[PDB]
Design a protein around this ligand. Structure first.
Ligand code: FAD
Ligand code: ODT
Length: 423
């Protein structure tokens, strides 16, 4: 437990940091400060304007099991009121097909899925807990495909891959199953499969903008932190405009990047240096032959097709001159990084192939996405080490790396961090 008059400095005004403020405030910790580097809040929930409506450069959707996000909507008064999500499936040559009608693959998938469901509910009980401080089963530390191979459920990858690889989280040849299954737990997977998906008319960013406004201390923006030191039981935060002292540090920003403006200790340097991330690239496009529906391309989710468009988003049904966003990955451990130029050429070429040629790209973003560690690093005890450092020199660790790269997970983690260490 931590004293209620502690001065608590929260770095980052994305969901993770905003929720930290919310839940600290609600537990009676009123002397918090959220420091944001940019001029805006919401982080990767980023919904800019175009032609009188908001489009999504980052996060788009949620599922009914997003309980922490419902608590936030309860507080802001926002509602799930966005346009309905609908999808078709394309081959890499633009051909529309329906995977579940595949007479060989169809049955293999449903048998694997059913078998996995049973395994998850028994053998792997506890897998779905938020965070990684409850040590998961050792099998879950293997790359997702190996985890499946071991259990004779390879064909379950067909259902899990679409809202995972296409959604920027990487490839099953290497991403530890622990991550896959805390995000796509059986319930969430079934919700997605069923199309039971939340969206917001004013963008996922809106509820975070409004959360910020409801906070007793809305974020301080445009804060360029040049150095943080932690001597004598205090946190000294140096910025370009001021430097100040706190009692507690909550990190919701990238931890490898933290090493560069901090008095990082040996463990912090050793362990945070192992963090790897996804280079997930979005392009906001105007197109001819406006799609009628969103399109996924399982062929382009293969590592051999890295940099190609894996999915694209049909948001506003009624205006053929509104924004269609495309999604691609620029990195894989077995491959050298694809350049943004070569990938932007693939956006144009792929969309042309799909029959929805691009007339214009008006915004582009490669995001710092899904920070995580390797299976080898997971197995070697990365989370036991880092969770065991919680509170060392009044510093706490949070955000995506500590849970999973989605807004419900990071908010959930921020909620429990207060329960775990402060209350
Ligand atoms: C294209 C895309 C689609 C996505 N789709 C979904 C989806 O459908 N559903 C879902 O749940 N999630 C989705 N996500 C993931 C989700 O947006 C993120 O997991 C979530 O925003 C993570 O929040 P965070 O606070 O942990 O980190 P971030 O959102 O990355 O925010 C971190 C904040 O800290 C700030 N910061 C960074 N460095 C510093 C510094 N040194 N000093 C001060 N501040 C700093 C940043 O500017 C930012 O405001 C998507 C993301 C992208 C990019
Ligand atoms: C519950 C969702 C959790 C995390 C999502 C993370 C990332 C999503 C990234 C890009 C999503 C691409 C949008 C494609 C439109 C989907 C419409 C549909 O599938 O029916």
């Amino acid at each position: 437990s931590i004293s209620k008059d502690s001065r608590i400095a929260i770095i980052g005004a994305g969901p993770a940091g905003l929720a930290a403020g919310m839940y600290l405030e609600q537990a009676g910790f009123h002397d918090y400060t959220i420091l944001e580097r940019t001029d805006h809040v919401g982080g990767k929930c980023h919904s800019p304007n175009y032609h009188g409506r908001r489009y999504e450069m980052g996060a788009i959707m949620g599922v009914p099991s997003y309980d922490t996000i419902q608590e936030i909507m309860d507080r802001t008064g926002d509602k799930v009121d966005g346009p309905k999500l609908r999808r078709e499936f394309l081959h890499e040559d633009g051909e529309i097909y329906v995977p579940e009608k595949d007479p060989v693959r169809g049955p293999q998938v449903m048998a694997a899925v059913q078998k996995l469901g049973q395994l998850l509910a028994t053998k792997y009980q506890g897998y779905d807990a938020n965070g990684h401080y409850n040590k998961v089963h050792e099998d879950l530390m293997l790359p997702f495909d190996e985890f499946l191979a071991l259990n004779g459920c390879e064909a379950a990858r067909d259902l899990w891959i679409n809202p995972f690889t296409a959604f920027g989280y990487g490839h099953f040849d290497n991403v530890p199953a622990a991550y896959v299954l805390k995000y796509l737990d059986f319930v969430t997977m079934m919700s997605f499969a069923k199309g039971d998906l939340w969206t917001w008319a004013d963008g996922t960013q809106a509820m975070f903008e409004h959360l910020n406004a409801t906070l007793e201390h809305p974020a301080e923006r445009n804060v360029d932190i040049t150095r943080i030191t932690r001597e004598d039981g205090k946190v000294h935060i140096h910025t370009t405009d001021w430097d100040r002292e706190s009692d507690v540090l909550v990190l919701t920003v990238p931890l490898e990047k933290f090493l560069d403006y901090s008095d990082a200790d040996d463990d912090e340097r050793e362990y945070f240096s192992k963090i790897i991330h996804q280079q997930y690239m979005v392009d906001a496009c105007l197109v001819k032959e406006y799609p009628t529906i969103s399109g996924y391309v399982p062929d382009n989710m293969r590592p051999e097709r890295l940099g190609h468009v894996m999915v694209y988003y049909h948001r506003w049904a009624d205006d053929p001159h509104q924004i269609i966003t495309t999604y691609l990955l620029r990195n894989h451990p077995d491959y050298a990084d694809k350049t943004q130029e070569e990938c932007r050429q693939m956006v144009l070429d792929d969309m042309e192939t799909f029959g929805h040629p691009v007339e214009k790209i008006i915004e582009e973003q490669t995001w710092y996405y899904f920070p995580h560690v390797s299976s080898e690093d997971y197995k070697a005890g990365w989370y036991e080490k880092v969770e065991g450092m919680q509170g060392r020199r009044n510093t706490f660790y949070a955000g995506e790396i500590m849970s999973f790269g989605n807004f419900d997970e990071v908010c959930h983690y921020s909620k429990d961090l207060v329960t775990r260490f402060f209350v």
